[PDB]
């Protein structure tokens, strides 16, 4: 479930609009490289190094993401001055290191080696003005849904408060959002100048966003904790409008979206010549033979019917083809939820079905169905067809219990032809493999020790100690780590799997210690040997 500010447009398929409209964002990273940014306590990393790592993490994630967002980099406290606002003696020690453009590996390499800490100090509000200028002068022609400025500073140095009103007015008028990144977490031995700087930062954020403005002030530490993992795959499900029918006289306007699917990266490996390193140099030629070669001008379509070979052209097949009415969602009947076993769930998707957008009458009608099925512990058996061409399916539509939203969940059920009737030997009724009382007690102790759940405050509510559905797919994280490693270090072999990845794929360390003891008893009680 999304926030209320998230428009439904993102889910509806329109010509280069909605899902098809390129959601682009302009980001200006405003980094403090001033003298004080290098000054740190012998125990903790300098703000400069901390901010540098946050920025690298952000840019790295953006390089592999599909977003197409544009990134610029403004530095302040540098020895030199490179500004379109410099004039004579204004906005000094502020450098536009990178102009608004797609991030690349040349930027990341540049961040790592070319950016050095400065010996000067600059006005952070002046750096913000320069940052606003970048967005104002470079978003020209380009279509950006969002414009953001991220400021990384220690707030250690003096600054003028004279431009506060022009700063706020331009951010509001140009719809530019702001975010602050500091060495410390927002509530402490910060300087008096830092306390002054922070009050202004607080005022700015409150003027722009209100009470929620304070939530846009972060520590570099918390930012590194959130940016260390690669960006998970987020796609907007296309809005599927249709009518849920009960007989031929009752119709309910509905809108369905894909809840679950086997998500994958779109971009894959291109087979290229080992020498030219180009795609066009490789070509696939599929030939036909009986041994004796055959020309395309001599092949017809056919199908096998057991031992029979039946010639059937695509033209004839097109007309004799089964024809059904498309975009159909029809109730066949209702049954006990118990009669529909989850072991029979078929297909590659799960559909969440809501009432048609902005239709109260449809919403009430569907809410009636949802609650009736829930209160009767029943489900609907429906006929589902995506469009006029799509093969129809038989599936289940069951109620979904949440307080923020009510919906029917659609999952395909099998056809008789899909079921595989295999008989397996009874294990309960086995004279050979029945376990002893001691063996059963060891397994009982194992299951208790290896519990992945815990009851909080005796509220009879189970807290999952190992969720797995919150974990991002490690395949993508791994692919990206390697792709990045090969880009920055071409001579180096592929790196090993990062520890945090393994750490998230393993159960809590508590579970592992408890497991080993009953596991040891199991190894002695259950003899196991290869045949």
């Amino acid at each position: 479930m999304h926030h209320h500010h998230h428009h439904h447009h993102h889910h509806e398929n329109l010509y280069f609009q909605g899902v098809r409209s390129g959601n682009k964002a302009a980001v200006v990273l405003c980094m403090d490289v001033g003298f004080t940014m290098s000054n740190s306590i012998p125990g903790i990393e300098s703000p400069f190094e901390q901010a540098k790592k946050v920025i690298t993490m952000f840019v790295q994630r953006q390089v592999f993401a599909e977003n197409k967002d544009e990134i610029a980099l403004v530095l302040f406290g540098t020895d030199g001055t490179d500004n379109p606002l410099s004039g004579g003696d204004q906005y000094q020690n502020i450098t536009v290191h990178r102009h608004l453009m797609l991030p690349d590996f040349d930027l990341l390499e540049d961040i790592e080696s070319k950016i050095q800490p400065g010996s000067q100090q600059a006005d952070f509000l002046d750096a913000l003005i320069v940052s606003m200028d970048v967005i104002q002068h470079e978003t020209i022609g380009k279509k950006f849904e969002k414009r953001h400025i991220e400021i990384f500073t220690d707030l250690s140095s003096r600054f003028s408060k004279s431009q506060l009103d022009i700063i706020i007015h331009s951010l509001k008028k140009c719809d530019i959002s702001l975010q602050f990144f500091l060495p410390f977490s927002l509530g402490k031995g910060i300087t008096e100048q830092q306390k002054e700087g922070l009050e202004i930062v607080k005022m700015v954020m409150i003027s722009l966003e209100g009470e929620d403005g304070l939530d846009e002030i972060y520590s570099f530490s918390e930012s590194l904790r959130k940016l260390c993992v690669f960006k998970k795959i987020e796609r907007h499900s296309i809005h599927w409008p249709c009518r849920l029918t009960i007989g031929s006289n009752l119709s309910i306007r509905i809108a369905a979206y894909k809840s679950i699917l086997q998500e994958r990266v779109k971009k894959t490996w291109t087979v290229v010549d080992a020498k030219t390193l180009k795609k066009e140099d490789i070509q696939k030629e599929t030939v036909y033979c009986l041994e004796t070669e055959v020309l395309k001008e001599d092949i017809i379509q056919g199908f096998r019917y057991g031992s029979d070979i039946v010639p059937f052209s695509k033209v004839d097949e097109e007309q004799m083809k089964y024809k059904s009415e498309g975009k159909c969602f029809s109730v066949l009947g209702f049954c006990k939820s118990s009669q529909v076993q989850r072991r029979f769930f078929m297909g590659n998707q799960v559909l969440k079905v809501f009432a048609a957008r902005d239709d109260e009458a449809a919403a009430v009608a569907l809410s009636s169905l949802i609650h009736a099925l829930d209160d009767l512990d029943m489900v609907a058996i429906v006929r589902y067809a995506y469009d006029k061409r799509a093969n129809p399916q038989v599936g289940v539509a069951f109620p979904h219990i949440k307080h923020n939203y009510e919906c029917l969940v659609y999952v395909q059920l099998p056809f008789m032809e899909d079921l595989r009737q295999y008989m397996f030997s009874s294990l309960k009724n086995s004279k050979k493999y029945a376990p002893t009382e001691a063996q059963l007690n060891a397994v009982d102790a194992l299951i208790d020790s290896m519990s992945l759940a815990k009851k909080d405050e005796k509220t009879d509510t189970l807290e999952d100690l190992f969720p797995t559905t919150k974990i991002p797919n490690p395949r993508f994280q791994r692919l990206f780590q390697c792709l990045l490693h090969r880009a920055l270090h071409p001579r180096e072999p592929l790196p090993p799997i990062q520890q945090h990845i393994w750490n998230m794929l393993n159960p809590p360390a508590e579970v592992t210690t408890k497991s080993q003891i009953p596991l040891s008893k199991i190894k002695t009680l259950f003899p196991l040997i290869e045949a």
Binding site: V27, V54, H148, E150, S177, Q179, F181, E216, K226, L227
Partner: peptide
């Protein structure tokens, strides 16, 4: 709701 750098 993530914004700017985190979104």
């Amino acid at each position: 709701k993530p914004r700017g750098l985190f979104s």
